[PDB]
Design a protein around this ligand. Structure first.
Ligand SMILES: CP(=O)(O)CC(=O)CC(=O)O
Ligand SMILES: CP(=O)(O)CC(=O)CC(=O)O
Ligand SMILES: [Ca+2]
Ligand SMILES: [Ca+2]
Ligand SMILES: [Mg+2]
Ligand SMILES: [Mg+2]
Ligand code: NI
Lengths: 419, 416
């Protein structure tokens, strides 16, 4: 292992092997600013930005003074690697520079318990993919039947859609049950009212680093240069609103009332120790989507649900990011193949993550099988879809020897509709 | 009228006064201007002339590089700005006319200015609200019996678009590469798209947001409509067709979407308002409004190929060919608590009337590449060729004046 001078519990999400980036403020100082999580502390990068003296960062220390991570994300991998090496040195148990500087160390650290986290970046565009084969198969079985499950394009390209950026909110933001239009009765006109089928969707998402120029694709051999790091995501959805609206132009108001992300962006370099070979694709993708670089990650994901009267949250999903059929390299490559310009801070989400076991299905649409099965949420309590007052928390971790790379929380509680 | 000379057929009389973001050779910083005649009035230079109650403590919005903060101030501020501008340009408040020093810094030629996007667009949405356009697509894709899908007459169908690839008029558009499936018995192929199209639309910018979780009631929707631009939603129909079921248009649209730079304020367009089209069935109460909010705006699309000496007009249409209003679109977009933000762009959908001369895309004008479009000088089109230039224009015709929209132009570059 590796150790910091900051005390780190063995099961901490935030050992020296992680070092995720986030935006926080405190009761002492309301300015949103950039920090790195270590143990139960935050290292304020605006305070220590003069210690980044290397070639990539010496002229660009102002990126650590910003209220968002966009400019640091836009600097690209030489800057990311330099920052990470600098932070691994400065936080090391055996390095005196920061460790023994009592006054600097005093103003550079703050407790995570005292901090308010904010969205880590200003997200210009958010895209949601559909890349978990079991998830898409489950939706197809439910909607179309066993024989017609996957549509003809699914095995040939990473299907995805443009999402709503404005309603991406940081963990802990309450989510109001949406009103909208639904058609519960096919023999009657649609109605207006509160959603009746409110759902969570277990996803992960990555932030884009340097963009590409308008009109210039990113070749798949270079896609890994544009992926900064990852967060957990809950794509909340209103299944009745979605079902009525989505043919033919896609999910819209069924998704755009709220999408939650966790605040700590785990850099790809922290996740590389947990990379595994990519799943075999058959049919083989077209050459522009073909890559040998391993880019599938062993990340254990868990979803809990706690009703408003419960004292214990129930774990309703245990899944893993390694199941996904299309990689992040393929998603990024496909997103830019037409010349579309990805920009720093854009967010590309995986799709709902389901494995083959029903215990690993990533939505309550799947876990309840379209409301036909009860989900056990603890002694004599069941769900099909979300109730008012329910809190959903997504967590994730990679497990090393004596350490984990964890993601903190992606939480939200459902508020009653305005009706 | 104004002390600035305005030619009779100008797009930009004192009745228009659209807002834009421009820069010059002398000053490369993007800044806010208003078009008048063939000049631009620089609002950063004259920001101290906005002395009324809504703007006197908020003059800094005119020093920004984008219109977002002025859009975000809301309608009292917009109305005061317009009245201030009209009084300055008529010389009823004569500071600008007679202060020669200020006047020489305040006005620059449109010809010498470079236009930029008018706002930083946080989210772009494209609707599907022209009935004849949706009907035509339905006929072509599904047959005449199943032209409209069951939801179309009940809600303003739309999808989230790509904000990053919205570009200002004049930007070259590269023909996109991507996946296509020309033969359904064989695997898809990768290559240059073959069915490159233009889509005639208009779009409006959002004013003040709504808070996350708080719908905008239809009664208040008119408070959030800042102003309008022309749009060409370029598309790759063969890429679109293969990708879009079931999650919607994606790479078929996102390689490029062009808007005109001059944002015509809604108060300029109010003289041209007409009754709303009768909706049957009547929409749910959350979508109902009595206020007229349908506009008589004449739209024209020209195409000019390589070698061709003059552009051919391939479409003449009107924004009154819309079934759902902008009020309904804005209200529907926020009914679920989605938070619209200042500078968001909500586009109408492709505009088609009943006359085939008014169909707003080459998918429709060529009827899925089965009919050749006459573009003059012996030449025909189904879809766009490399080197083709498409220019959209629009105007309202008043008595003795016109409110024009400028241009929404782009030329097709060969695939890379
Ligand atoms: C069909 P769906 O609701 O899963 C569409 C998506 O939102 C994509 C996904 O999460 O997998
Ligand atoms: C079917 P389509 O390509 O017209 C979908 C849209 O893009 C909406 C529209 O322009 O009307
Ligand atoms: Ca989703
Ligand atoms: Ca369109
Ligand atoms: Mg959502
Ligand atoms: Mg487009
Ligand atoms: Ni070791």
């Amino acid at each position: 292992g590796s150790m910091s001078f900051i005390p780190v519990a063995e099961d901490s999400d935030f050992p020296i092997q992680n070092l995720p980036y986030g935006v926080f403020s405190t009761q002492s100082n309301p300015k949103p600013r950039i920090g790195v999580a270590i143990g139960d502390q935050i290292l304020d990068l605006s305070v220590i930005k003069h210690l980044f003296t290397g070639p990539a960062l010496s002229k660009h220390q102002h990126v650590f003074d910003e209220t968002t991570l966009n400019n640091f994300m836009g600097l690209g991998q030489a800057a990311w690697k330099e920052a990470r090496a600098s932070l691994q040195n400065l936080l090391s148990a055996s390095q005196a520079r920061l460790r023994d500087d009592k006054e600097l160390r005093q103003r550079a650290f703050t407790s995570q318990a005292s901090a308010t986290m904010h969205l880590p970046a200003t997200i210009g565009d958010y895209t949601d993919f559909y890349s978990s084969r079991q998830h898409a198969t489950n939706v197809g079985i439910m909607f179309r039947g066993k024989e017609n499950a996957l549509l003809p394009n699914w095995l040939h390209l990473p299907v995805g859609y443009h999402g709503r950026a404005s309603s991406i909110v940081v963990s802990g933001t309450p989510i109001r049950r949406p009103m909208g239009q639904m058609r519960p009765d096919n023999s009657k006109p649609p109605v207006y009212g509160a959603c009746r089928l409110l759902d969570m969707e277990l996803e992960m998402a990555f932030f884009v680093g340097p963009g590409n120029r308008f009109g210039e694709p990113i070749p798949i051999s270079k896609a890994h240069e544009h992926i900064f790091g990852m967060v957990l995501m809950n794509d909340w959805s209103a299944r009745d609103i979605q079902q009525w609206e989505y043919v033919p132009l896609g999910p819209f108001l069924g998704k755009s009332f709220g999408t939650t992300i966790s605040p700590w962006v785990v850099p790809m370099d922290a996740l590389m120790p947990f990379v595994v070979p990519n799943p075999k694709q058959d049919p083989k993708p077209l050459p522009y989507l073909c890559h040998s670089q391993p880019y599938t990650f062993d990340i254990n994901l868990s979803v809990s649900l706690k009703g408003e009267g419960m004292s214990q949250a129930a774990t309703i999903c245990r899944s893993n990011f390694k199941h996904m059929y299309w990689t992040m390299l393929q998603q990024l490559t496909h997103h830019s193949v037409n010349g579309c310009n990805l920009r720093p801070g854009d967010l590309l989400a995986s799709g709902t993550i389901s494995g083959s076991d029903p215990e690993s299905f990533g939505s309550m649409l799947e876990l309840s099988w379209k409301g036909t099965k009860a989900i056990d949420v603890g002694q004599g309590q069941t769900r099909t879809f979300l109730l008012d007052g329910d809190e959903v928390i997504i967590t994730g971790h990679c497990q090393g020897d004596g350490y984990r790379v964890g993601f903190g929380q992606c939480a939200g509680k459902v508020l009653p509709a305005l009706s």
